[PDB]
Amino acid sequence: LPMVGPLALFRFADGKDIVLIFMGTVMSVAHGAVLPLMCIVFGDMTDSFIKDSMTLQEDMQSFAIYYSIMGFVVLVAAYMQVSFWALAAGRQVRRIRKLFFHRIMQQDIGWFDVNETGELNTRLTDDVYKIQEGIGDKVGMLIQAFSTFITSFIIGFVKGWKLTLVILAVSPALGISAAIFGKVLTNFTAKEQTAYAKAGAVAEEVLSAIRTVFAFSGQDREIKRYHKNLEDAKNMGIKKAISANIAMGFTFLMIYLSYALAFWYGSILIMSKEYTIGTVLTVFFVVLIGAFTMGQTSPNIQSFASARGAAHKVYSIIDNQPCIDSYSDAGFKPDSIKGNIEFRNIHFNYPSRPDVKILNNMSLSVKSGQTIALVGSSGCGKSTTIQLLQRFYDPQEGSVSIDTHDIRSLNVRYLREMIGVVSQEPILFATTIAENIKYGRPDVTQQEIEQAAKEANAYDFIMNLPDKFETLVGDRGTQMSGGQKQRIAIARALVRNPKILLLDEATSALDAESETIVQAALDKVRLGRTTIVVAHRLSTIRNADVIAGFHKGDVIELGTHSQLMEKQGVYYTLVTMEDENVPPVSFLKVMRLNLSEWPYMALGTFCAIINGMMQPLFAVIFSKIIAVFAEPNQEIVRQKSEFFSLMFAAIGGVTFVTMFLQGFCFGKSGELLTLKLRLGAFKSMMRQDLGWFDNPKNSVGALTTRLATDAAQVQGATGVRMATLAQNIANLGTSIIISFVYGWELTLLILSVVPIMAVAGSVQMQLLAGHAAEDKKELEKAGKIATEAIENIRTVASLTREPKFESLYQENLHVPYKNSQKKAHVYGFTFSFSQAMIYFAYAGCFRFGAWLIKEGRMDAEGVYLVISAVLFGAMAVGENYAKAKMSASHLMMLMNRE
């Protein structure tokens, strides 16, 4: 699909907005240079320690100040990046909303008839949200990662002649792996799609015709068939999960082989001494971080793509100006008008379906003070004419004369303002009685307001108003009645006393008293007013002096009703005719569901425990690698580096195998759990009486969606969640035990920086400060009001209130816009704080390790062990539970129910 270029994306930024974008860009570039630069100083510090492992205090102090200044500079840079980018996003979104609404209210009615209102609402809400999210932080981080990738390569150019090409020559192997896995992945996805297709097929057939299931009473063959289909789905899904786990393990193994090969090549350089160990470690770490950053940029790339598509559609709307602009500033705008209106040979076709000539030969004339009506069959060109007279549609053929001046020459605002129109079923606007009447005119006082209200005979129901006109209309007009609705409508039409009235079926769909009151209001209005009433009620039509029959957008008869009856025209025919309960279920019971699978659970738990243990082993081997690098001992060090490279390969292999077994075991266990729970659900359901399935919560689509979604969710979570708990607990226990054995002071230092980082980490990104709920709710409310305005577009036009509804739209946007700025500020604060915490932690941990070294209770190798191991444990902890708990509670309630 067409998608606009990035140059077009920021086409709504004004001068100060350009400065904002530029400042954000430069700050993001600084941040993305820091990241690789952070790794640079990290490797430099690593080398300095390696040599120091065998000049200490001053060196450590210098390193510490460098880290601290790096932390401060990244704090400032990131905070400013987020703040400026978010503020630019907010200004851009506000301007986008304003101009979008301006064009929408500018576009003619045919534009709406092309684009259904629901689609416009979805656009204005979701696409605006997408563009906001894209520009705000996603673009900033995108630029930042671009810069980091570029800087990693420049730094590899500084001294990496061999390592750069070696890691790039890993790229064909890495891509070979990623694609050889992907080719099997596509085939497996198709296979499992077939499997779930059969499973959902049996599900849909049994549920949709579950009444037939009871009728035929033959649940034997159907239950057995369900079991068969589920068994096949198990046979397939077990393999799918096994394959996915092998893919993950193979990715890990490729990573580890790259590690070991790079290390062996570095050892070769040290043998030749071409590259100092420090330089090799620096370049390797930096290239690795650059590669991982580039890889993990993908979600942001998708975010930008979505933003670009949304922006393309939005700007397509914006630049699609109408054939006529309501806000035009050209025309006669006569100071007066007699009022007569004449139409000739009107010819219009909707832009959506411009293939049938709906409108043809509507020669008609209305004289001031003359009562001429229009009657015909449904969709006989009635409303199209009324739309035209407001210049909703340009007559391709014909003429539209208003007292020697056509609608073409006259301005639109002026014309609409002095013209009144009432639809077949007009709808009040979502505002109190006061404002609903104020739309009459802006220059209106209370006394005349009540005068005009009573002018419509509405008096009867105002003495009962709790607050008179201040009385609230009520949601959706629930506290409202059709006759009273027409009363407010006609009153708001008359308040400004438009010269001419087009009452398009504004009498029907009412009760006897309601019809009487509207008829009385109309008769009072007909005093000295030029009227065109296309209505269905016989009283008004007969009261009308001249009536014109109609059919299929064609003139047939006109004059007194007697001629219509004599010809029996169309007039004669018209005359003759879920989440509440969610009881917390004991995890013991949920786990106990795997009764027979006890061996499977145990074997999988062993696999997960070993897997979790490995990572600390990675930390230890890394630490000892550094250690051996410390002592020159060239022969011993080269041999031991080879040894620990082979150990890296061994770790890759053990990770691969443990992933293989864990995936297989947990997949089988969870899939058997899925089978058992599905069979139990079927049995419980068929126990349930017919009425049980008539509840709206028990619709066929909803129930089958529950079945499939919840089964998959519990299968994944129940197996994955316990395994993950075990793995993480192993990581934490071993890391903490290692730290405590090494030293219980730096231990506590690490174990305190960790929690403060995590608490101030991902949770704060979307949870703390209590902005989320209010901001989302207010945005939803403003969008709802805008959506209502769009829906009632015809009435909004007849009112000529588009500017004022835009004004109210922006007014109610103001507060959520301020909340947007507030949330952006706090988001920036937490993000920068999180980023800087890492550097400050590095500095403090390393400094305290140095202090302990001065006391001798620890060694630098232990320092590296502790820091690296704890960091890797933090990363591992990253890898739903509530969804699984709720689903399991649902299933248990459904089964155990008698």
The half-sphere exposure of 600 on its side-chain side, counting CA atoms within 13 A, is 19
Would 169-263+600-742+881-898 and 341-576 be classified into the same CATH topology? no
Residue type, 753: V
Residues pairing with 275 in the sheet: none
DSSP 246-294: HHHHHHHHHHHHHHHHHHHHHHHHHHHTSS-HHHHHHHHHHHHHHHHHH
Q: Is 153 helix (H, G, I), strand (E, B) or coil?
A: helix
Query: By three-state DSSP, how is residue 533 classified?
Result: strand
Cα–Cα nearest to 708, from 235, 237, 311, 335: 237
Q: Which residues of 286-313 are buried (b: 16+ CB within 10 A; e: fewer)?
A: bbbbbbebeeebeebeebbebbbbbbbb
On whether the CB atoms of residues 52 and 854 are closer than 8 A, the answer is: no
- CA 870 to CA 872: how far, in whole Å? 5
The answer to whether the CB of 593 falls within 8 A of the CB of 827 is: no
Torsions phi, psi of 531, nearest 5?
-125, 145
Distance CA 361, CA 347 (A): 8
Q: Which two tokens stand for residue 715?
A: 């299968």
Written in H, E and C, the secondary structure of 344-379 is EEEECCCCCCCCCCCCCCCCEEECCCCEEEEECCCC
Distance CA 29, CA 145 (A): 9
Question: Counting Cβ atoms within 10 Å, is residue 92 exposed (0-12), middle (13-18) or buried (19+)?
Answer: buried
**CA dist., res. 486 & res. 422, Å (int):** 9
Return the bridge partners of 375, or none. Answer: 549
User: What tokens appear for 612 in the block?
Assistant: 């979790």
CA 339 – CA 822 distance, rounded (Å): 54
Instruction: Tell me how far CA of residue 805 lies from CA of 127, 489, 637, 788, in angstroms.
Output: 22, 17, 78, 11
CB 726 within 8 A of CB 665: no
- What tokens does 787 get? 């959506």
Residues 60, 846: Cα–Cα separation, whole Å: 8
List the structure tokens of 359.
Answer: 């409108």
Coil, helix or strand at residue 443: coil
The identity of residue 307, as a single letter, is A
| DSSP bridge partners of 397 | 347
Give start and end residues of each alpha helix (H) in 349-507.
382-389, 412-417, 433-438, 446-455, 482-494
Nearest alpha-carbon partner for 648 in 267, 98, 307, 354:
267
The residue type at 563: Q
β pairing state of 341-347 and 397-402: antiparallel
Q: How far apart are CA 20 and CA 82, in angstroms?
A: 11
Instruction: Quote the distance between the C-alpha of residue 556 and its chain's center.
Output: 54
Sign, Cα dihedral of 276, 281, 284, 289 = negative
CB atoms < 10 A from the CB of 377, how many?
A: 16
- Angle at which helix 634-687 crosses helix 219-272, to 10 degrees, equals 170
Task: Please answer whether residues 36 and 294 qualify as being in contact, where contact means their C-beta atoms are separated by less than 8 angstroms.
Answer: no
Instruction: State the Cα–Cα distance between residues 570 and 362, nearest whole angstrom.
Output: 16
| Answer CATH for 341-576 from 3.30.930.10, 3.40.50.300, 4.10.640.10, 3.90.1150.10 | 3.40.50.300
CA dihedral 294, 299, 304, 305 (to 10 degrees): 110
* Helix H or strand E segment including 422: strand 419-422
* Count of CB atoms situated within 10 Å of the CB of 388: 22
Question: Do 385 and 400 meet the contact criterion of CB atoms below 8 Å apart?
Answer: no
Up-side HSE of residue 577: CA atoms within 13 Å toward CB? 7
How many CA atoms within 13 Å lie on the side-chain side of 883?
Answer: 12
What is the DSSP code string of 581-644?
T-PPPPHHHHHHTTSTTHHHHHHHHHHHHHHHHHHHHHHHHHHHHHHHHHS--HHHHHHHHHHH
The strand order across the sheet containing 530-534 reads 419-422, 500-504, 530-534
Nearest Cα neighbor of 596 from 706, 675, 707, 656 is: 675
> What Cα–Cα distance (Å) separates residue 206 from each residue in 221, 685, 707?
12, 11, 13
Q: Would you say 78 and 71 are in contact if contact means Cβ atoms under 8 Å apart?
A: no
Closest-CA residue to 506 (of 636, 514, 28, 104): 514
Distances in Å between the Cα of 320 and the Cα atoms of 92, 283, 324, 330, 658 are: 20, 53, 11, 20, 59
The DSSP annotation for 447-478 comes to HHHHHHHHHTTGGGGTTT-TTGGGS---GGG-
What is the token pair recorded at 36?
């690789």
DSSP assignment string, 640-695? HHHHHHHHHHHHHHHHHHHHHHHHHHHHHHHHHHHHHHHHHHHHHHHHS-GGGGGS
**Sheet containing 341-347, strands listed edge to edge, beginning at the edge strand earlier in sequence:** 364-366, 341-347, 397-402
**Nearest CA among 468, 464, 467, 486 for reference residue 477:** 486
Q: Is 768 helix (H, G, I), strand (E, B) or coil?
A: coil
Strand partners, 400: 343
- Asked if residues 137 and 85 have their Cβ atoms less than 8 Å apart, the reply is yes
State the Cα–Cα distance between residues 651 and 621, nearest whole angstrom: 10
Distances (CA, A) of 148 to 20, 287, 292, 302, 407: 22, 10, 11, 19, 61
Whose CA is closest to 138, among 86, 98, 79? 86
How far apart (Å, rounded) are the C-alpha atoms in residues 309 and 311? 5
Q: Do 628 and 640 form a contact (C-beta atoms < 8 A)?
A: yes
Burial of 721 per CB tally in 10 Å (0-12, 13-18, 19+): middle
The span from the CA of 229 to the CA of 584, in Å, is 32
Token pair of 254 as six digits: 């490729």
The angle that helices 298-319 and 57-106 make with each other, rounded to 10 degrees, is 30
Q: What are 237's two structure tokens?
A: 């899904």
- The experimental method behind these coordinates is cryo-EM
Strands (E), 75-226: none
**Looking at residue 431, what DSSP letter applies?**
S
Cβ–Cβ under 8 Å, residues 237 and 168: no
Q: What are phi and psi of 27, to 5 degrees?
A: -65, -40
The DSSP line for 2-34 is: ----HHHHTTT--HHHHHHHHHHHHHHHHHHHH
Domain ranges of the chain: 169-263+600-742+881-898, 341-576
**Alpha-carbon distance 207 to 205, whole Å?**
6
* DSSP label at residue 402: E
CA atoms within 13 A on the CB side of 497: 12
Amino acid making up residue 348: F
Closest by CA to 352, choosing from 122, 120, 112, is: 112
- DSSP SS3 for 399: strand
430 DSSP assignment: S
The one-letter code for the residue type at 138 is: K
Q: 532: number of CA atoms within 13 Å, CB side?
A: 28
Q: Three-state DSSP class for 858?
A: coil
3-class DSSP state of 198:
helix
CA distances to 351, 581, 669 from 591, rounded to whole Å, are 61, 21, 11
Rounded Cα distance between 826 and 429, Å, is 37
- Per the CB < 8 A criterion, the answer to whether 431 and 799 are in contact is no
Residue 380 one-letter amino acid: C
Name residue 163's amino acid. Answer: L
Report the distance separating Cα 439 and Cα 417, nearest Å: 11
Helix (H, G, I), strand (E, B) or coil at 718: helix
Query: Which residues face 401 on adjacent strands?
Result: 342, 406
* 79: three-class secondary structure by DSSP: helix
**DSSP per position, 789-802:** HHHTHHHHHHHT-H
**In whole angstroms, what is the distance from residue 431 CA to residue 428 CA?**
8
Task: Residue count of the chain, please give it.
Answer: 898
From residue 205, alpha-carbon distances to 208, 225, 299, 700, 707 in Å are 6, 12, 38, 10, 14
Q: Torsion over CA of 40, 45, 51 and 52, rounded to 10 degrees?
A: 170
The partner residues of 344 in beta bridges, in order of sequence, read: 399
CA proximity to 735, closest of 745, 723, 725, 747:
747
Which residues precede chain breaks (C–N over 2.5 Å) in the chain? 54, 577, 879
Distance CA 544, CA 541 (A): 5
Q: Which residues pair with 532 in a beta bridge?
A: 502
CA–CA distances in Å: residue 97 to residues 71, 111, 678, 822: 38, 18, 48, 19
Kind and range of the H or E run holding 840: helix 802-855
Q: Tokens for 392?
A: 């909703």
First-to-last CA distance in the chain? Answer: 54
Cα separation, 573 vs 550, in Å, equals 12
Angular region, 800: left φ>0, alpha ψ -120 to 50, beta rest? left
Answer for the pair 137, 22: CB distance below 8 angstroms, yes or no: no
> Hey, what CATH class is 169-263+600-742+881-898 in?
mainly alpha
Across the strands, what pairs with 402?
A: 341
Q: Report whether 193 contacts 230 (CB < 8 A).
A: no
